[PDB]
Design a protein around this ligand. Structure first.
Ligand SMILES: COc1cccc(-c2cccc(CCc3cccc(N)n3)c2)c1
Length: 377
């Protein structure tokens, strides 16, 4: 696994990518690591933002599936042609696999101007694969065709340029301190989990916990923010705003509609409280909690040419589709996607940003009753 350490790169707000090769001879591409989707989709045409794209005509091992795929988002989409081909990960396990690949032939507001990735690796399960769950995800193909154990782990560091590790098939104990604590994957579609309690600064929100997971809570390397359902976001902001009334910021800030700036080196960490999410544990009536800092939910915006300050965007936002524990959360922790035992492990990341005051934490066990009632059906 030492070969796989530091195999991720990125830029803030723009995601974490791994090098992959597709076809024979190998074409190298940088591929976004996304635990919130289930298609391996890659640029296959010369869109002007792209450094590189998959040239199927150059590959002897390419096979057409003669079926297209169309994938909408709110504002934007990608569309493509399905096929299979041989896929490796240079700084991953020493194997080659025949995987489905969606050759992206048209898109809108998908690729990012200035980004250094050309595709997406969906690491979630077949249920949310498009056009349907019969299209086998990459990781399912990998596990099926090789002896790679059915698990992967992610250390997203952030740390301008960002970095991290994706350990495929195992865990590397150099990437975390203390103990791993595991929360069950409620259902294998997204990496769905259950949050059972939330504390801002130690003090809890006292909401029907069911709300915390209305209609989902998921772990998602492809979302920057900690996203929260309307009503939980509402309550959540209310307490953070209160926690932090010392200084003042507009209403738009909290809605992610304006940025906040303080002069270089002048940011007040401590007027902002820590956020603790209690996750369902492995055992009845037993939970654990992960604790993140404002340096996680207060994210720098790289360069604004209309300012000189240290400008941050408030990284919590509301959702119609549930809680999303994005890079804000994951950058605090080493996260183990233990597919084989249907559980996600969290430990303090050896690379998370800390000081000599407060620190990211994973703590347990706690006693929490009625954890099953926290899940929405
Ligand atoms: C931290 O990961 C990021 C940050 C910004 C943008 C993306 C990004 C951009 C275009 C496409 C995708 C993959 C599709 C997608 C959309 C929404 C949510 C998820 N998980 N995946 C990601 C990922």
């Amino acid at each position: 696994f030492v070969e796989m350490v530091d195999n991720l790169r990125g830029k803030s707000g723009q995601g974490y990518y791994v090098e992959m090769t597709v076809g024979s001879p190998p074409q190298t591409l940088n591929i976004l690591v996304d635990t919130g989707s289930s298609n391996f989709a890659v640029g296959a045409a010369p869109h002007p933002f792209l450094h590189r794209y998959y040239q199927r005509q150059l590959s002897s091992t390419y096979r057409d599936l003669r079926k297209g795929v169309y994938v909408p988002y709110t504002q934007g989409k990608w569309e493509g042609e399905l096929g299979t081909d041989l896929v490796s990960i240079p700084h991953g396990p020493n194997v080659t696999v025949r995987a489905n690949i969606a050759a992206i032939t048209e898109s809108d507001k998908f690729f990012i101007n200035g980004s250094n990735w050309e595709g997406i690796l969906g690491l979630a399960y077949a249920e949310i694969a498009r056009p349907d769950d019969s299209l086998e995800p990459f990781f399912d193909s990998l596990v099926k065709q090789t002896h790679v154990p059915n698990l992967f782990s992610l250390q997203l560091c952030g740390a301008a340029s960002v970095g991290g590790s994706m350990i495929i098939g195992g865990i590397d104990h150099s990437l975390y301190t203390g103990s791993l604590w595991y929360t069950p994957i409620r259902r294998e579609w997204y990496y769905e989990v259950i949050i059972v309690r939330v504390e801002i600064n130690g003090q809890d929100l006292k909401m029907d916990c069911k709300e915390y997971n209305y209609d989902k809570s998921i772990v998602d390397s492809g979302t920057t923010n900690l996203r929260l359902p309307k009503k939980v976001f509402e309550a959540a902001v209310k307490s953070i705003k209160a926690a932090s009334s010392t200084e003042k910021f507009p209403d738009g800030f909290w809605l992610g509609e304006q940025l906040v700036c303080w002069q270089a080196g002048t940011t007040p960490w401590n007027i902002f409280p820590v956020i603790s999410l209690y996750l369902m544990g492995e055992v009845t009536n037993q939970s654990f909690r992960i604790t993140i800092l404002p340096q996680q939910y207060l994210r720098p915006v790289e360069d604004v040419a209309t300012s000189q300050d240290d400008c941050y965007k408030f990284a919590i936002s509301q959702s119609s589709t549930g809680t999303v524990m994005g890079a804000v959360i994951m950058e605090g922790f080493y996260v183990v996607f233990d597919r084989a035992r249907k559980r996600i492990g969290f430990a303090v990341s050896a690379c998370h940003v800390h000081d000599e005051f407060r620190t990211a934490a994973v703590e347990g066990p706690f006693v929490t009753l009625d954890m099953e009632d926290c899940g929405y059906n």
